Design a protein around this nucleic acid. Sequence first.
RNA 1: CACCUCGAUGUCGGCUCGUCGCAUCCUGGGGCUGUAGUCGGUCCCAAGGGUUGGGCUGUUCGCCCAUUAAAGCGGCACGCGAGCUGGGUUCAGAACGUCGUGAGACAGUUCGGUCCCUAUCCGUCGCGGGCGUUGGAAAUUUGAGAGGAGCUGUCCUUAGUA
RNA 2: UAAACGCUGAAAGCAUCUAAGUGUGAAGCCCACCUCAAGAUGAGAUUUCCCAUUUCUUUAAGAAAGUAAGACCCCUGAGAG
Lengths: 38, 206, 59, 147, 174
Amino acid sequence: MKVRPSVKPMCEHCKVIRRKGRVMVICPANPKHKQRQG
Amino acid sequence: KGILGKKVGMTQIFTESGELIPVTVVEATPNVVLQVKTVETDGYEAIQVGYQDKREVLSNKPAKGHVAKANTAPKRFIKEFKNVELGEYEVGKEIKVDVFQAGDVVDVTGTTKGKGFQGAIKRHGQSRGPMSHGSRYHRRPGSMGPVAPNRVFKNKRLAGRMGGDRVTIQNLEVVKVDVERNVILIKGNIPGAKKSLITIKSAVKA
Amino acid sequence: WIARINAAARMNGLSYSKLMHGLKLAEIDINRKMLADLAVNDAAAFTALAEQAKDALSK
Amino acid sequence: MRTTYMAKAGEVERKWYVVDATDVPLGRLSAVVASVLRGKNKPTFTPHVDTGDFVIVINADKVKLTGKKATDKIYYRHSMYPGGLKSVTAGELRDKNSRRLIETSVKGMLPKNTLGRKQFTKLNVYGGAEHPHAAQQPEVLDITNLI
Amino acid sequence: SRIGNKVVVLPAGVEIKQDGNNITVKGPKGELTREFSSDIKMNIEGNEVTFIRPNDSKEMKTIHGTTRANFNNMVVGVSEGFQKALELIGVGYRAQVQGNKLTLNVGYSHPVEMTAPEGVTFEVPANTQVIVKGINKEVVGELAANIRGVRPPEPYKGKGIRYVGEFVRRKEGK
RNA sequence: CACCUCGAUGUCGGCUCGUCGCAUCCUGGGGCUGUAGUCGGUCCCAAGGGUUGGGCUGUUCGCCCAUUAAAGCGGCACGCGAGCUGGGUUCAGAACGUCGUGAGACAGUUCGGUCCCUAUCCGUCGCGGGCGUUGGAAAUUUGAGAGGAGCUGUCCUUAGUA
RNA sequence: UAAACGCUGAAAGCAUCUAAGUGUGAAGCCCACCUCAAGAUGAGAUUUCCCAUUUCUUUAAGAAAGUAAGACCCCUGAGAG
Ligand SMILES: [K+]
Ligand SMILES: [K+]
Ligand SMILES: [K+]
Ligand SMILES: [K+]
Ligand SMILES: [K+]
Ligand SMILES: [K+]
Ligand SMILES: [K+]
Ligand SMILES: [K+]
Ligand SMILES: [K+]
Ligand SMILES: [K+]
Ligand SMILES: [Mg+2]
Ligand SMILES: [Mg+2]
Ligand SMILES: [Mg+2]
Ligand SMILES: [Mg+2]
Ligand SMILES: [Mg+2]
Ligand SMILES: [Mg+2]
Ligand SMILES: [Mg+2]
Ligand SMILES: [Mg+2]
Ligand SMILES: [Mg+2]
Ligand SMILES: [Mg+2]
Ligand SMILES: [Mg+2]
Ligand SMILES: [Mg+2]
Ligand SMILES: [Zn+2]
């Protein structure tokens, strides 16, 4: 999990979502792309 | 399980295998259940237990009336035991040391010996100041706090009356039980001066 | 006086502000001291005043 | 002329009301309750004399907390010992000790003086719909339009 | 393209009992009951059921879809139930069931014993293949997830408990 | 910068006593890994507790020795001198280098050099008396609330197994 | 409960830990353990004891004077100070 202010998709598989009011990026392909805004 | 007794003193016992262990001798003349408290009448469950029969001239009409239900002489000590099975106790019932068996694990409650007015060094185990090198600070309680609050924070520990506190020692071992002499030998040492009241209960942690 | 008048007006189905606006519309000049006195002592008189105030508001 | 009426202690009759808190926002219930306890609803209101009526709040457990107040509104209290701060959420207070929830809300709204504390004593809060004060013959006080 | 609008049929002999809330579904597999929201309207035919929302608001769209999905899950569970298939992989990993107790040996110093609720059952066709079978999809998934979490798969060698067929990325550890 | 203090707000370091913040040193939970395992790296949650004994120097700092799970970083008048010390820095003596024609001085060193106060109030730690608690008494009690405690190593086994 | 991981699930036919619904999850928070604690003026509860006296004022929750149950003064002391 990368916790950073700027969360953006890193590859075509990355999907941007919001959980509990927080922006998050989830990638089924590369777990390195998992990001949370914080 | 629980009982009330008096701290007779300390000695030592040789266990099987010849190990030598210090024991506290606590006498408990059979206690008597003086009153049974219930949710219906008092809102909580407990049994009131009296111990150490008292001379009549030392008792009061209200106290004599209170113990009349149990049909016994006035008792010097009275205490409530909780976490017991009320169904097994009834007013006038006796409790003897045999309630415990050797090797039982118990909690022992007493009132610690009083030391009177004591300084911070003894009372709270604080460090002295240097005794030489020009020091004029030997047995004093340290700084009272920082400047900013313009006050002293609560719990800044200082000199005062030491001892006389209710202390419970946990997980003591019932080394032996002598029903004939109404004695319980408990491994270790327990709070309180000789002839003071002692409360034995089945260890809650167990 | 304003607080007491407000309580009385609420009991008569009105707020203090609406009562005073209605009284001004109806040309009533009775001041707050007299109004508070009526509310505490002459409830019927205060109710009559409130009725005229409400009628003026309706008109 | 100096004729303004001033109420006296004990001459004013204090009635008893029952207020149902079911699905009423905590603050709005408290505001109306505080006015009643102070006596702002009666023309005989006298600031330096207690003249308000008694309040019995029922169904305190069902008081309403809008928004996320159930978990985000925090009640703090300091024991006055260093680092002696304690907190409890409004939702937890409602579940476990709703009387405390309503009482704290109404204490905040009554005056902070001898008269205010005396008036606070006239409040009685009960989670649930039944109260032990039938002997006082309290009467229902609808607040649907008052909130 | 809308789950909430999409109709739900009633196969075999599944039956539905209505109420202000707490819609119940009964059939060969068992019974279920869910407290559906009071905003979505449910129309019932002899074999077809439809759900309607008051408007096209964000909230009504969301709840409409979810309620239809939940109701459909109740129907399908009562009809055929649900099953999660787990394939535990390891040199000496195995499982065995005594009634509603599933005991797992997955390399830990102690065996892991799990208990099913009444609405779910454990098959254990083989000592390495487990199947959680139940009527409630949520419970079925929850139990299967718990079993998998007992020892979730690892990438380097693939050991661990997996959902049968789930992709497990593997790192070429040296 | 010069807004309080020059009809005085005592200055470094140490000692005694701590308390708080978390931007976490250890311990706890977790994600990613260029994570095989043992170790780790990075980031996220976490302030409950713990977080050393010396050599040198007035020292803080720092280096070194030897340990530890760890040897955290900061604030509180760089916390704490009506609580202590007074080694350093600012008095009067003396001397060296240096500057000055000089008295003297530091762009520097060196040896020696007075640390007062009976606690009124609040605050803090203990202990009493009065009255209240709605008849007067003797005991036993519930717990609103509050404080305390909260750390951790190594070895054996599981297993020389994964 | 935190971070984190979910299950079911639409908005958004898919996907999705979240919106509704449901769960795991820390030496941390609330309990659990120890102690203080009804001046908790919101002054709580239980058991036991005493008994409705006398005199005068006044309808007074009046006043004073003997007492009961009980407590204390005083005296011998310590396990207390
Ligand atoms: K100055
Ligand atoms: K890590
Ligand atoms: K900490
Ligand atoms: K040194
Ligand atoms: K030195
Ligand atoms: K500090
Ligand atoms: K000094
Ligand atoms: K000072
Ligand atoms: K003062
Ligand atoms: K009391
Ligand atoms: Mg970037
Ligand atoms: Mg020392
Ligand atoms: Mg202040
Ligand atoms: Mg200027
Ligand atoms: Mg001055
Ligand atoms: Mg942090
Ligand atoms: Mg030496
Ligand atoms: Mg300082
Ligand atoms: Mg000072
Ligand atoms: Mg010269
Ligand atoms: Mg210089
Ligand atoms: Mg000398
Ligand atoms: Zn990606």
